[PDB]
Symmetry: C2
Subunit: 119 residues, 2 copies
């Protein structure tokens, strides 16, 4: 389970977490998702809040519904590849902004990261 914080709407944190499960392949295309009530119990979250997260994902095409059969993970490699690209861009943007905020120049930051990556 994910852990939630109080700064962002819970439904959006749930959506973010579900997207991560789909991008990493923990949940694969056509996988059947929990009902909103099942997911609420699983996450210890209000099912209304879960519903808002599912609605967000369905609207954006990451999950889809079949009548009287619930919700399923979309199969679309191109769609998930572009999501991963956008999340990756966001991560790099934040890294450089955070570095700037502590006076850590790009060159130094990248070298530190490479060193850490090689352990």
């Amino acid at each position: 389970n994910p852990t939630f914080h109080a700064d962002k709407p819970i439904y959006s944190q749930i959506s973010d977490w579900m997207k991560k499960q789909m991008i990493t392949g923990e949940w694969k295309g056509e996988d059947k998702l929990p009902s909103v009530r099942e997911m609420g119990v699983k996450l210890a979250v209000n099912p209304n809040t879960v519903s808002r997260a599912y609605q967000e994902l369905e609207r954006a095409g990451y999950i889809y519904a079949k009548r009287g059969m619930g919700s399923f993970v979309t199969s679309d490699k191109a769609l998930f590849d572009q999501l991963k690209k956008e999340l990756a861009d966001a991560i790099t943007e934040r890294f450089l902004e955070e570095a700037k905020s502590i006076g850590l120049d790009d060159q130094t930051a990248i070298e530190l990261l490479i060193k850490r990556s090689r352990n």
Copy 2:
């Protein structure tokens, strides 16, 4: 001014922000800080909360008091150099953990960052 969020104690967010002003040299050694009440008005924050942030910094040696003269930024290049190093390590650690969470491998992440850095 910094903007505050609801997930972490406000006093610690204030301490974090003040540390950043000192590391980047916006506030230099021996600079006189606002009183806790002045800072509270400046930040639109409860002065009790500001006091907790100042106490945190004084306890750790980043600011110091003179009797009936208020608080001042410590002059100690070695101390601030080590703080910057620790914050930089934390930033790189989080970058790699966040990358892992979206299935972005270290090599790809570093290349993207280098590309972004060169624009």
